[PDB]
Amino acid sequence: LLGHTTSVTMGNSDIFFLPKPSNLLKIALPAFVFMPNLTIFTRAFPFYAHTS
C-alpha cells in the first residue's frame, strides 16, 4: 500500500446556505469593486491605470 495511501480521499463539509431577509432592511449597503472596467477606455487602460 505504498502508492495507494494518497488515494484515500475525503470530502469537505462546508454548507453554503444563509437566509437573506431583506424585509428587515430598508437601506442600501456599500459594495466593493473587484476588477477594473475594461469595456470603457480599453485602449488607454495601461496609460491611466496608475492614476487616481
Binding site: 431583506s22 424585509n23 432592511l25 430598508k26 437601506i27 442600501a28 449597503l29
Partner: protein
C-alpha cells in the same frame, strides 16, 4: 434593502395624492378632461 426603502417611500408619497394617477412625465398620453375649456 434599497428597493424596499424606495417602495416604502413610494407608497406613502403616491398612494394618497389624488394627483398622481401615473407619472407626470407621461401625462401627454392621458385622456383629456371634459370639464376644462
Amino acid at each position: 434593502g434599497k428597493i424596499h426603502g424606495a417602495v416604502w417611500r413610494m407608497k406613502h408619497l403616491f398612494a394618497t395624492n389624488f394627483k398622481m394617477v401615473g407619472h407626470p412625465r407621461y401625462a401627454y398620453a392621458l385622456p383629456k378632461n371634459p370639464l376644462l375649456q
